Symmetry: C2
Subunit: 71 residues, 2 copies
């Protein structure tokens, strides 16, 4: 079962994915996108430190958020 | 229609609500919670600066995210 560091990573990856999605739609401002770029580097770093692939973590994060939002 | 700054705020508020929800459930680690507290203060600040109420913005953010995730 996933530890809270792992769950925190999964959730962070998924939420970054949503924010990136909004950016690609042109829906958000420049400071939002700045934050998104810095966060991208931090998340890549954490991926390396934790040894967890971002794709996998993003999918898992999707499920975690799903579980708290259909509940 | 809301400009990209307003949308960025709405979305940030909603996503913070999700992260706080996870923290309240005891599911995330302490650095995630540190980030969460820092973010809570930043978002109160942006609420004052933009003159936008946090509850309403959180509601709007919910709708924006919903729209891109059932898409």
């Amino acid at each position: 079962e996933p530890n809270p560091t792992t769950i925190a990573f999964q959730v962070d990856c998924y939420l970054w994915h949503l924010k990136k999605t909004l950016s690609m739609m042109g829906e958000v401002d420049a400071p939002f996108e700045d934050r998104l770029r810095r966060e991208q580097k931090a998340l890549k770093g954490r991926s390396m430190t934790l040894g967890i692939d971002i794709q996998s973590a993003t999918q898992e994060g999707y499920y975690k958020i799903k579980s708290i939002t259909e509940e």
